[PDB]
Amino acid sequence: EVQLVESGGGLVKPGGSLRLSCAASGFTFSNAWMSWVRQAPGKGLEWVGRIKSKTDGGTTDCAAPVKGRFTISRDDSKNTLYLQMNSLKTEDTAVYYCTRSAEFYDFWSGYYTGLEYFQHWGQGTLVTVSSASTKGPSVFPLAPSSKSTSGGTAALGCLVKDYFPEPVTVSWNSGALTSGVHTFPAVLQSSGLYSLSSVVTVPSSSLGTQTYICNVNHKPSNTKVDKRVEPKSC
Amino acid sequence: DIQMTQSPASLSASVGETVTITCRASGNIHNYLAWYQQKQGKSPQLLVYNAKTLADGVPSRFSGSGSGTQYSLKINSLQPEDVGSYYCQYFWSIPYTFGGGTKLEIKRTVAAPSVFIFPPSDEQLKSGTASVVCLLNNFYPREAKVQWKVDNALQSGNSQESVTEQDSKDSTYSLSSTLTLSKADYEKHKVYACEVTHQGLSSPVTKSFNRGEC
Amino acid sequence: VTQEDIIRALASPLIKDGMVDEDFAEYVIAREDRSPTGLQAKGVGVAIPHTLGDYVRDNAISVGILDKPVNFEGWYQSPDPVPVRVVFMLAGRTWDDIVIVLKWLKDVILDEEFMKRLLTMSDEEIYRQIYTRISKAPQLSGINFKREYVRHL
């Protein structure tokens, strides 16, 4: 029931501006204190800022490295939390999370207060600060053959090459085939583009009767690719 | 500002052990500490708050303890699905500092990799490049050496590795190594091979193919 | 007793009334280290700890009388810090509200007889004298000040 749906993340040039949104539902948004937390690729969580509810002033606080550059606001009529970014730097590249702080009731004062630990998190939205431009992937088959077979089992996959920015999702047979699937983490090459592979192990008896398609979705470029992987017989 | 020092940064542990992660605060934080778990590709989930109170739905084998500046998260009877990262957090006042994090690895029996190789696709060739993929499947431990040879010449500065995260059920790794050559270079040479060194292999294993055969 | 003990003691009644956030003392301490408020005015030392930002719900003032002087770093730079016996803790919503009180406090601490009564009167008499002086300052009067906001330390 409690849901925090974030959007607005994407690619933006250094020194530019970008605004994130967090649509909340399943709780009384106007009473909740809300926060932002970010996590650079491969790094740890870092607190960004907080906004109080209107009855508690509706004021904000932000971490020192981003104070004076970032602005937090809310629109209780839309049940939406915002993070406004200005003068963005490469070191702002991170997944940004929307969070709801815990509610504590103060007996002596009679007021509610927010405690800054987070039970409910948004799904996160990736912000990429780079001068590079958006590029969709090229998808190439990794065909099964005697060189990828061992013990009644054959390996096959798809090569997702030269895309920017993250992320890309890969499923097999429209999500039906999930067992034995390995989608590798993307690796950033020196060209500035990303590449990854996704492989799956299937019974060799099924080659020639079962069709294997890898579904590649690169939402930053709005690119969907369905590549059939044909078996090699020789 | 309060600083949180989380130790150890990395942790490897066998199934069934009791694992202890510690956080030391730069000042007395009076039990205003939370613990989080983050699995790969997922958002963090709260485990403990007020240093000792288990969050809703959290398995009882988790427990937090401590006081003053010293706190600990204990995981009793470690399970393979506990692989991931763990974070402490001070939450009483600005800047609500998260610890640096602890990455948890599961220790298991040695498992040798299955090695597969894929020549480049004809579609990629037409574009003027050639990627050769060597796949290492379901192995443990993570440490592995993968060397590319083209007509018995070792390749340097033209390959890229990627390792999956530890499987949440069998605690094994998979690894891909991708050798990228120009189409002109790929067609000049005949034998393409990846040599794999791993603890579960008595001798290094070489998977090869001859260009054009398959 | 330390400056931290003073600030926590004077913040406690403001926290209980919800005049300020529960962690108000953590921000006053950080501000006092960053910009000290020790003042020397005619043989009596005064400190005016306060905060900037959004940690105050309602303007308030909390007064502490020290039996023995404790050192505060000077508002103005010098060696030999200020031995303070009267502490005026300020809870101000904005920077503009704090300056208003600083105006009034300057006239207060320059009133010699007023300050020396603070050092000798009881908690109840300190309240009545201060609350009366507040009522006569229309630019302040709304500020929260209660009997519970006076303490000997």
Author numbering:
A (entry chain H): 1 to 234
B (entry chain L): 1 to 214
C (entry chain A): 4 to 156
Question: What did the article's authors report about this structure?
Answer:
Membrane-proximal external region (MPER)-targeting bnAbs, such as 10E8, provide exceptionally broad neutralization, but some are autoreactive. A series of scaffolds displaying engineered MPER epitopes, named 10E8-GT and displayed on multivalent nanoparticles for improved immunogenicity, can bind 10E8-like precursors in vitro. To determine whether increasing antigen affinity improved 10E8-UCAH B cell recruitment in GCs, we used 10E8-GT10.2 12mer, which includes additional GT mutations along with additional mutations to reduce off-target binding and additional glycans to shield the 10E8-GT scaffold from generating competitive or off-target immune responses. Next, we determined the crystal structures of 10E8-GT10.2 complexed with Fabs of one GT10.2-WT mAb and one GT10.2-10E8-UCAH mAb isolated at day 14 p.i.
The tip of GT10.2-10E8-UCAH mAb bound to the designed binding pocket of 10E8-GT10.2 in a manner consistent with the mature 10E8 mAb. The GT10.2-WT mAb bound to an epitope adjacent to, but partially overlapping with, the MPER helix graft of the immunogen, suggesting a site of competing antibody responses. Although GT10.2-WT mAb does not sterically clash with the GT10.2-10E8-UCAH mAb, it does substantially overlap with the mature 10E8 binding mode. The median affinity of naive 10E8-UCAH mAbs was ~660 nM, whereas that of GT10.2-10E8-UCAH mAbs at day 7 or 14 p.i. was 565 nM and 1.5 µM, respectively. , indicating a sizable median affinity gap between GT10.2-10E8-UCAH and GT10.2-WT mAbs starting day 7 p.i. To test whether endogenous CD45.1 wild-type antibodies inhibited the binding of CD45.2 10E8-UCAH mAbs, we incubated biotinylated 10E8-GT10.2 conjugated to streptavidin beads with the GT10.2-10E8-UCAH or GT10.2-WT mAbs for which the structures were determined and used 10E8-GT10.2 conjugated to streptavidin beads as a control, followed by incubation with a fluorescently labeled GT10.2-10E8-UCAH-PE mAb. We observed complete blockade of GT10.2-10E8-UCAH-PE mAb binding to 10E8-GT10.2 in competition with unlabeled GT10.2-10E8-UCAH mAb, indicating the validity of the inhibition assay. As such, competition from higher-affinity endogenous CD45.1+ B cells might have interfered with the maintenance of 10E8-UCAH precursor B cells in GCs, even when initial precursor recruitment to the GC was high.
